[PDB]
Structures are given as C-alpha cells and as structure tokens.
Write a protein that holds these residues in place. Structure first.
Motif, PDB file in Angstrom:
ATOM      1  N   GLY A   1       8.740 -15.989  32.282  1.00 57.53           N
ATOM      2  CA  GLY A   1       8.771 -14.794  31.481  1.00 57.53           C
ATOM      3  C   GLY A   1       7.408 -14.506  30.851  1.00 57.53           C
ATOM      4  N   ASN A   2       6.337 -14.968  31.492  1.00 59.02           N
ATOM      5  CA  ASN A   2       4.942 -14.625  31.117  1.00 59.02           C
ATOM      6  C   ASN A   2       4.410 -13.558  32.040  1.00 59.02           C
ATOM      7  OD1 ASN A   2       3.767 -16.103  28.677  1.00 59.02           O
ATOM      8  ND2 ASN A   2       5.028 -17.700  29.750  1.00 59.02           N
TER       9      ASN A   2
ATOM     10  N   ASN B   1      10.013 -15.517  36.950  1.00 57.05           N
ATOM     11  CA  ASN B   1       9.780 -14.280  36.270  1.00 57.05           C
ATOM     12  C   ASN B   1       8.312 -14.193  35.711  1.00 57.05           C
ATOM     13  OD1 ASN B   1      10.117 -11.788  35.044  1.00 57.05           O
ATOM     14  ND2 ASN B   1      11.223 -12.579  33.249  1.00 57.05           N
TER      15      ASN B   1
ATOM     16  N   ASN C   1       5.899 -15.266  26.662  1.00 56.54           N
ATOM     17  CA  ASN C   1       4.678 -14.838  26.024  1.00 56.54           C
ATOM     18  C   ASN C   1       3.961 -13.855  26.922  1.00 56.54           C
ATOM     19  OD1 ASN C   1       4.136 -16.146  23.263  1.00 56.54           O
ATOM     20  ND2 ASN C   1       4.848 -17.910  24.540  1.00 56.54           N
ATOM     21  N   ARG C   2       2.622 -13.701  26.800  1.00 59.51           N
ATOM     22  CA  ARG C   2       1.871 -12.754  27.711  1.00 59.51           C
ATOM     23  C   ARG C   2       0.798 -13.485  28.516  1.00 59.51           C
ATOM     24  NH1 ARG C   2       4.159  -9.262  28.831  1.00 59.51           N
ATOM     25  NH2 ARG C   2       2.883  -7.329  28.510  1.00 59.51           N
TER      26      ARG C   2
HETATM   27  C1  LIG Z   1      11.201 -11.375  32.450  1.00 59.30           C
HETATM   28  O1  LIG Z   1      10.227 -11.503  31.421  1.00 59.30           O
HETATM   29  C2  LIG Z   1      10.079 -10.454  30.476  1.00 59.30           C
HETATM   30  C3  LIG Z   1       9.203 -11.092  29.424  1.00 59.30           C
HETATM   31  O2  LIG Z   1       7.896 -11.145  30.020  1.00 59.30           O
HETATM   32  C4  LIG Z   1      11.410 -10.034  29.870  1.00 59.30           C
HETATM   33  O3  LIG Z   1      11.275  -8.869  29.029  1.00 59.30           O
HETATM   34  C5  LIG Z   1      12.483  -9.784  30.895  1.00 59.30           C
HETATM   35  O4  LIG Z   1      13.676  -9.893  30.138  1.00 59.30           O
HETATM   36  C6  LIG Z   1      12.567 -10.843  31.986  1.00 59.30           C
HETATM   37  N1  LIG Z   1      13.037 -10.221  33.199  1.00 59.30           N
HETATM   38  C7  LIG Z   1      13.952 -10.670  34.043  1.00 59.30           C
HETATM   39  C8  LIG Z   1      14.128  -9.810  35.271  1.00 59.30           C
HETATM   40  O5  LIG Z   1      14.577 -11.684  33.798  1.00 59.30           O
END
Ligand SMILES: *[C@@H]1O[C@H](CO)[C@@H](O)[C@H](O)[C@H]1NC(C)=O
Ligand SMILES: *[C@@H]1O[C@H](CO)[C@@H](O[C@@H]2O[C@H](CO)[C@@H](O)[C@H](O)[C@H]2NC(C)=O)[C@H](O)[C@H]1NC(C)=O
Ligand SMILES: CC(=O)N[C@@H]1[C@@H](O)[C@H](O)[C@@H](CO)O[C@H]1O
Ligand SMILES: *[C@@H]1O[C@H](CO)[C@@H](O)[C@H](O)[C@H]1NC(C)=O
Length: 286
Positions: free
Chosen positions: A184-185, A208, A161-162
């Motif tokens: 992944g935030n 991440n 998400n963000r």
């Molecule tokens: C990390 O997170 C972003 C989503 O926020 C995603 O687009 C990307 O795939 C991920 N990057 C890595 C280096 O895993």
C-alpha cells in the motif's frame, strides 16, 4: 496526593487510568510509583519534560490530539517498555531527540500521525526495540541507516505510506527482522542490495505498490522467507521478470499470485507460467 483528578488508580500493578476524559493536558499529581499510565482517548495537545514519572513501563497516548512533543519529554523514562502515540493526526513531525532515553523500549506505535518524514537519527540507541509501527502516515522516503541500531527489531510495519524507493541501506542493521509490511505504498524500485542481511525475515508484504520488477539479489538475500505477497503490482513479464521467475523455480515459500500487466500478449497470466524459452532472447545476467 493519591490519584489525578477524574482518573482511577490501582495498586497492583501501580496503574493510573485516565482515558476518555477529553483532557487537554496530562493530569497533575501522577503517583511516582506509577507503572502503567492510560491516557488514550483524550484531547491532549502537547507533551513536555517534567510531566511523566521515572517508573513508567507502559504509556498509552493514542487518539489524542498531539501536535507537539517538546524536547526532553521522554528523556528520563529509562524503564519505559511500551509507548503508544498512534492516531494523533496533527502530530506531523518529531524532533530528532524525541526518543533519547528510551533504551528499554520494546514497542513503539506511531501509526496515523501524518508523518511525511522522519529525522535520520530519530531511532538511534533504541536497542531493545522489538515492534515499530509506522503504518498509515504519509512517509515519502526512508533514509539509509534509519533503523541501524535496531538489532532486536522483529516487526516493522510501513504499509499505507507514500514510499517510492527502497535504497541500498534502508534496512541496514535489521538482522532480527521477522516481518516487514510495505504494502500500500507506491514503491517503484528496490535496490539490489536493499534486503541484504535480512537473514531471519519470514514474511514480506509488497502487494499493492507500483513494482514492474524485482532484482534477483533481493530475493536471494531472504534465505528464511516463508510467505511473500506480490499481487496488485503492474508486473512486466518480459526480460525483467527472469530473476524473479528463476527464484520461483527453486524457492519453497507461500505466495500470492504475480499477475503480468505487460506485455499485452501475457497480460493476466501469472509470472510463473512463463517457460525458459520465453526468456531465450534475453541478454545474459547483467
Ligand atoms: C492500495 O493502497 C492505497 C494506499 O496507497 C489504498 O488507498 C488502497 O486502499 C489500496 N488499494 C487496494 C486496491 O487495495
Ligand atoms: C487538534 O489540534 C489541531 C492542530 O493543532 C487544531 O487545529 C487548529 O485549530 C486552531 C483553533 O481552531 C487553529 O489555530 C489552527 O488553524 C488549527 N490548526 C490546524 C493545523 O488545523 C484543533 O483545534 C485541535 N482540536 C482539538 C479538539 O483539540
Ligand atoms: C493509507 C494510504 O496511503 N491510502 C490513501 C488514503 O488516503 C485513501 O483512503 C485510499 C483510497 O481508498 O488510498 C489512498
Ligand atoms: C468528549 O468530546 C466529545 C465532543 O467532541 C463528546 O461527544 C464526548 O461524549 C466527550 N467524551 C467524554 C468521554 O466526556
């Protein structure tokens, strides 16, 4: 009145299979005894009350084209145990009362719906809920107490998400939580007391994100932790690293690596390679 048009019906358990028809709406004539209703992979655009029957246990609506769910639509599905609304990329917002009625709900899927926010009280009263999937939307923030009634929630998926911050009471009421995925935030800060009460949590992903540091109290508040992922953050290996470093001296958990991004003389090293003497010029606990 035996089976909706173009679908297949089965009698044990009572099941209506309506997937993959390019329906633009939920079919009419659903038998009232239906316990399982499979509507995934259609092009349905909105839901309304008076559509679904009261016996449903399982309702799959993922990969449709939902943009509106009208008030009252789920209100009489007291028995519903699983609701999958994932992958409706134009859905975008939910009204505060969408899930009112759903007290027996155990899993709720809302991944990839383009949610940027949620109403603060949208999950109130979901006392049976065990799995909540909110990954890969665009959520910008989570309010304090957003999950406060979810005393049985075991998995909460919030990755992709963000999110930027986790505030003091964001996870209040999550005493059963076992796995919390936040990778992944763009997280930059975690409040000292954000994990307070997460006494059963065994897995935590934070990889991440944009974390330079984490407070000592946050780790101390996870007594049952077993696996923590921290990699792909710009960790600061200066005085800010000390509460995390100290927790690593005592903790028995599997872990990812924790690679310093700064200062330059420590860039690339793992945060646990530091020694007590690297911290001797650090102000005492404040
Ligand atoms: C990390 O997170 C972003 C989503 O926020 C995603 O687009 C990307 O795939 C991920 N990057 C890595 C280096 O895993
Ligand atoms: C999926 O639903 C979306 C969102 O409602 C639809 O996109 C709209 O298309 C109509 C007609 O082309 C326009 O009024 C809007 O400009 C579009 N809105 C948005 C937000 O893009 C799309 O038509 C739907 N597709 C199918 C195949 O149902
Ligand atoms: C889930 C999420 O927030 N990710 C976004 C996504 O738009 C993109 O695909 C990816 C770049 O590869 O990272 C960013
Ligand atoms: C539904 O729509 C698409 C056209 O976008 C088509 O490719 C597909 O074969 C149709 N599917 C079914 C199962 O009728």
């Amino acid at each position: 009145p035996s089976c909706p048009m173009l679908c297949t019906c089965y009698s044990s358990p009572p099941t209506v299979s309506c997937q993959a028809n390019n329906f633009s709406s939920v079919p009419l004539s659903l038998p009232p005894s239906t316990q399982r209703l499979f509507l995934q992979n259609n092009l349905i655009r909105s839901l309304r009350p008076g559509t679904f029957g009261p016996n449903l246990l399982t309702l799959w609506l993922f990969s449709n084209n939902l943009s509106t769910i009208y008030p009252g639509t789920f209100r009489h599905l007291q028995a519903l145990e699983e609701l999958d609304l994932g992958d409706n990329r134009h859905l975008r917002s939910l009204e505060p009362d969408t899930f009112q009625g759903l007290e027996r709900l155990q899993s709720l899927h809302l991944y990839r719906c383009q949610l940027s926010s949620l109403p603060g009280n949208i999950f109130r009263g979901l006392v049976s809920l065990q799995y909540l999937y909110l990954q890969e939307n665009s959520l910008l923030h989570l309010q304090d107490d957003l999950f406060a009634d979810l005393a049985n929630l075991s998995h909460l998926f919030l990755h992709g998400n963000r999110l930027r911050l986790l505030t003091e009471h964001v996870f209040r009421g999550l005493g059963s939580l076992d796995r919390l995925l936040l990778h992944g935030n763009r997280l930059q800060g975690v409040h000292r007391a954000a994990f307070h009460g997460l006494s059963r949590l065994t897995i935590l992903y934070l990889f991440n994100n944009s974390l330079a540091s984490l407070p000592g109290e946050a780790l101390a508040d996870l007594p049952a932790l077993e696996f923590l992922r921290l990699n792909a953050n710009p960790w600061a290996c200066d005085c800010r690293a000390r509460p995390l470093w100290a927790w690593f001296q005592r903790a028995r958990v599997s872990s990812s690596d924790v690679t310093c991004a700064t200062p330059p003389e420590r860039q690339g090293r793992d945060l646990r390679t530091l020694r007590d003497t690297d911290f001797q010029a650090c102000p005492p606990p404040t």
